[PDB]
């Protein structure tokens, strides 16, 4: 090893975990709920129709 002041690998791992946890939250919400729209943070045309 050469650098300990910044572990960029840990940073990229954190970013990947954050994206995956966003996907997981979306899935859990849509699963507990019956709907697919769910207060349309998602597409707007769908709820408008």
């Amino acid at each position: 090893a050469q650098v300990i002041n910044t572990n960029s690998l840990s940073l990229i791992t954190q970013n990947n975990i954050n994206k995956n946890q966003s996907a997981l939250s979306s899935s859990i919400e849509r699963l507990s709920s019956g709907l697919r729209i769910n207060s349309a943070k998602d597409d707007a045309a769908g709820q408008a129709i």
């Binding site: 090893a1 650098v3 572990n7 946890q21 997981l24 859990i28 699963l31 697919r36 729209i37 129709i49």
Partner: protein
Amino acid sequence: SEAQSRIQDADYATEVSNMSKAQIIQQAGNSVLAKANQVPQQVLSLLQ
């Protein structure tokens, strides 16, 4: 009613698969993150 269903339906077959994928990826990320934290530790071996 049948037409409106298609726009707002959970489709559990896909949602449980997405949830399982997310759980697997999160556990894998936590594993590799705990494993990556030991990388800056080997400097002490050079120190002494």
